[PDB]
Design a protein around this nucleic acid. Structure first.
Length: 103
DNA sequence: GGGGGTCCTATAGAACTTTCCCACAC
DNA sequence: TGTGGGAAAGTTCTATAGGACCCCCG
């Protein structure tokens, strides 16, 4: 987002100001934070920061991963070898990461 | 000035990857 | 020249902070 997430202290401050029935304009003045942001925190504090964001995609498909492992499970070929063998177009390092993730 | 609202959009911050080192190995 | 691995920098993700743009009251 355009700004950082409300921290613990700024949420605690929001909290007590709410119990003191401070206006929103005034609240956003004292913590130098947009009203937009505060309004949403107070409407439902328990779920602030709660909604995950779908991540970027891995560089390798489940197939490619499975082939990479099969190649390394069998023989001592280098990561680079495997990458060229399955014409993989993912970094030599990524392959190693996959191999290492398989125990 | 005080108070309130709705909606566009650039980005935080995370997930994942790649680059860049390193001590070593041929 | 290469390796694999640790660290740091890059890429790629989308929910959300900012703030634009509305309103009314004294």
């Amino acid at each position: 987002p355009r700004g950082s997430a409300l921290s613990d202290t700024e949420r605690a401050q929001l909290d007590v100001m709410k119990l003191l029935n401070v206006s929103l304009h005034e609240m956003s003045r004292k913590i130098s934070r947009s009203r937009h942001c505060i309004r949403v925190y107070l409407k439902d504090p328990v779920s602030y920061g709660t909604s995950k964001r779908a991540p970027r995609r891995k560089a390798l498909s489940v197939r490619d991963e499975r082939n990479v492992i099969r190649a390394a499970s069998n023989s001592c070929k280098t990561a680079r070898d495997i990458r060229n063998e399955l014409q993989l177009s993912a970094s030599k390092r990524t392959i190693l990461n996959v191999i290492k993730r398989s125990g």
